[PDB]
Design a binder for this molecule. Sequence first.
Ligand code: FMN
Ligand code: FMN
Ligand code: 23W
Ligand code: 23W
Ligand code: NA
Ligand code: NA
Ligand code: NA
Ligand code: NA
Ligand code: NA
Ligand code: NA
Lengths: 404, 404
Amino acid sequence: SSVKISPLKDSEAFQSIKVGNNTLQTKIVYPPTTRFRALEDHTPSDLQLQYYGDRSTFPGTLLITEATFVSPQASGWEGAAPGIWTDKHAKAWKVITDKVHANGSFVSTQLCFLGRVADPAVMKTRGLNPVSASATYESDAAKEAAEAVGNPVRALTTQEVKDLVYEAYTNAAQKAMDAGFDYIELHAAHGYLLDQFLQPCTNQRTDEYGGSIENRARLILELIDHLSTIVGADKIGIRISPWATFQNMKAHKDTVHPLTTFSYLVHELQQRADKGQGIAYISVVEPRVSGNVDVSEEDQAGDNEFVSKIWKGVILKAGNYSYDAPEFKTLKEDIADKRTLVGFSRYFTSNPNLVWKLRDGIDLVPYDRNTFYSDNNYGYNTFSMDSEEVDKELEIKRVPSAIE
Amino acid sequence: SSVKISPLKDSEAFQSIKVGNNTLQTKIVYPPTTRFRALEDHTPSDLQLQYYGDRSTFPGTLLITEATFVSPQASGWEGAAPGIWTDKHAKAWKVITDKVHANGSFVSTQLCFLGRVADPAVMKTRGLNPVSASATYESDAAKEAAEAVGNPVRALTTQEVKDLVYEAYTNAAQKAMDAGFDYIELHAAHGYLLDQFLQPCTNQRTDEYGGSIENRARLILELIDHLSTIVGADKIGIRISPWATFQNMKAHKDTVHPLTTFSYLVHELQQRADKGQGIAYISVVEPRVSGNVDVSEEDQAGDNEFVSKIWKGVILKAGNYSYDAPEFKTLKEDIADKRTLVGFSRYFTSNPNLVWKLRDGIDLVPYDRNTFYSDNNYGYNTFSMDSEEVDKELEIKRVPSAIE
Ligand SMILES: Cc1cc2nc3c(=O)[nH]c(=O)nc-3n(C[C@H](O)[C@H](O)[C@H](O)COP(=O)(O)O)c2cc1C
Ligand SMILES: Cc1cc2nc3c(=O)[nH]c(=O)nc-3n(C[C@H](O)[C@H](O)[C@H](O)COP(=O)(O)O)c2cc1C
Ligand SMILES: C=C(CO)C(=O)OC
Ligand SMILES: C=C(CO)C(=O)OC
Ligand code: NA
Ligand code: NA
Ligand code: NA
Ligand code: NA
Ligand code: NA
Ligand code: NA
C-alpha cells in the first residue's frame, strides 16, 4: 500500500551537511542498490544513466551506486552488474556522474567483490575460481554446486590479498576518479568479500590477515590507508552490517560478537580521523534489515549506537526507515545529532523523486520486489513515467543498451 | 495585493544552466538591490548576512549583491551602502558568501561607482569631489547643490580613468575574490559612472575615453579586458539598462540611440567570447522598468531583443516579470531559448523564499516600498519571521551591527 507520510521539509533532513569536501543539501540518501541493468560486459547502460539521473533532481543529494565490481575476480553474479576496472567502464560511468553533477548532486560508487558467494559456473567461464579469506561456503548446497563443476572456493594467498590492495582496488579507485565519482565506498557488509575477511565464521587464515580480530580487520584498514593516499580520505566511505545474517554470516552467533569486530574497526577509523585522515562517512545497516530482507524486532540482537559513540564524523544509516511512518519518529531521532544521513533503498526504486516526496509529505508509491533483479526496463525506469505512457510489453523487451 | 501565480516547477525555470564555471539549478535570480543596511564604514552587517542567507535556500540560486562601492571615490549616498575595498570589507563579505555557498548557491557582487550623482556634501567629508566622465549634473538643482558647498562635479583626468582600471576596480576585484564572490558584475546601468561614460549626454570627453561610440565604450571594455586577466572572464558579468531614463539619462532622446550604444558594446563582448574570453553573463533591464520605477507601455521606446540576437551566452533579464501573472507568459517566452535567466528584485524583498514560491505557485507577499531604503531591520529581515513574533518597535530600533 501507498505510505502516508508527514513532510520532512522543516526537519534536520533539509539542513546542509559537509561530507568530505562536498556539501549535501538533503540528508536523505539513495544507498547502493543492485538492479542488474548493466551491460553484459559490465559497462553501465543507457538505462542506468536515466535511472541515476532521475534520482538526482533535488540539488545536493548523495546517490550511492549499486555494488560495482573492482575486477573480473570480484564478479560472480548471473545478473548483469556494473564494473569499474576498464577505461570503457569509467567513460560510461562518467556520463552518469556528469548527469548527476549537472543537477548539483553527488555520487559515491560502491566497490564490491563477491568472494565465497560467487557463482562457480560463472567464474569457471572466466577461468577463475570463487575466492575468499578462507575456503568456505555459505551452505552445503553451494559447496556441492562448486565441487560438481570442479571449481571449488579457494583461499586467497597472502600475495593475492596484497594484490587486492595494490592492484584490484587501486585500479578501481583510479578508474572511479576517471569516472568522476565523488567518493568510493568499500562494501564491507552483507557477507561479501570484505565482510568475509572481517568476521571469524568466514576467516580462519593463519597469515597476517587472519587469526585475531586485528588480523581479520587488517585487509580492510590496509585498503582504507592505501586508497586514502591515492584519492584522499575525504573521498572514501565504507559500509558495514554488524547485525546481518545475510549469506550465512553468523553475526551474534559467531565466535567473536559483531560489537567486538565492528567497534574495533570503527575505533581504528576514528583514530585515523584524529590524525587528519578521517574518511568521509561510515555507512551502517540498521538491525531492522539484513541484506535485502527485513528482520523481526524479535530477531534483532543489537543496535548501531556504538558507531555513534565511537566515530565522530558522518554516519549514514539505512533500513526500513518508514516503519514508523507517517511521523518518522526514529528517523528524526537518528538525525538529531546533525551528523547523520538517512538512506532509503526500496522506496527510492519506486519513487525516483523520493527526496521531494519526503520533503513535502507526498504519498510513497509502493515498490515492486518482482522487478528488483530482472534484466529489463519494466519496473526500472518506468516509475518515472505516467502509466498511460508506459507500454509494458515494449519496456519488458527493453534490455540495457550502450549509452548514446 | 498578494499575487496569485501558477507553479513554475515544470518550466525551463528549473532546468540547470552553466553560468561561467558554476551550474545554477534555478533560472530565477535575485538582482542587485540597494537597501542601505550596511555599516557606517561600508562593512557588510549582521542584517545583510541573514538577508542574503535567507534568499539562498533553493540550492543553486544565483544572488547578486546590492551595488557595492569599489573605492571611497566610488561612494556618495547618504544611506549606508556596502563596499569592497578593504580587508575588513572582504572578511565580512566572506561570512556572507560562505553562508550562501553552504546552501549550494552562488553570489555575484555588483561593483558600483556613483559618479555625477554622488552627494556633494557627503563627498566633501571625504575631501573628495563628485567625479564623472564629464562635468555634468543630473539636474539644475544638483548643480546648484554642488556649487553651494563649493564641491562641483569634475571630469576625471585621463590618468584618473586609467586609475579606475588599474587601481580602483583592480583592488575591488582582488577583494571580491578574497571575499569568496563567484562573480563580479560591472554596474553599467541606471545613469551611474559606467553608464555616464557610455552615453553621449553624460560624456563629452576629448581624450581616448570620449568623442565617439567606440571611445565612450573604451573604459568599460578596458575594465572587462583587464579584470578578465585577473579573475577570469568566467567570473565577470555586466549590467546595462539601454532604455532607462533614470537619473536623467536621455536614452532614446540622446544624440546616439541606445540601440547603437549598447549593440556596439554587446557585439564587442561577443567577439571576446568568440576568442575564448566570454564573460559569464550580460544582465539587462527590461523596458518595463527604469531604475527603481515602472515605465508605461506608452513610454517604452525599444526592447532588448538585440542582446539576444548579438550575444550568444547567458543573459539575465529583469523588470516587472509578474506583470502578466498568474501565467507568466512573458517570462516563459523569455526563458524558452534555454540561456536566459529571469530576475525578481522587488518581490524578493518581501519573499525571501521567492524561488520556492515561484516553483510551487504560492501567493506572493506584497513588498513595502516605504522600507526599501530605511536604515533598520523593520521591512528588511522581518519578512522571514512569522508576524506574531515580529516586535515592530524593537526591529525599527535594530540598526545594522558588526557580524558576530
Ligand atoms: C534490490 C536490492 C538491492 C540491494 N543492493 C545492495 C547493494 O548492491 N549493496 C549494498 O550495500 N546494499 C544493497 N541493498 C541493501 C540496501 O542498500 C538497503 O540497506 C536495504 O534495502 C534497507 O534499506 P531500505 O529499507 O530503505 O530498502 C540492496 C537492497 C535491495 C532491496
Ligand atoms: C529598492 C531597490 C534597489 C535597487 N538597487 C539596485 C542596485 O543596487 N543595482 C542595480 O543594478 N539595480 C537596482 N535596482 C533595480 C532592480 O535590480 C531591478 O532591476 C528592478 O527593481 C526591476 O525588477 P523588479 O520588477 O523585479 O523589481 C533596485 C531596485 C529597487 C526597487
Ligand atoms: C543485493 C544485495 C542485497 O543486500 C547486495 O548487498 O549486493 C551487494
Ligand atoms: C537603487 C537603485 C535603483 O535602480 C540603483 O540602481 O542603485 C545602484
Ligand atoms: Na534534474
Ligand atoms: Na536540476
Ligand atoms: Na544519530
Ligand atoms: Na539554507
Ligand atoms: Na540548504
Ligand atoms: Na530569451
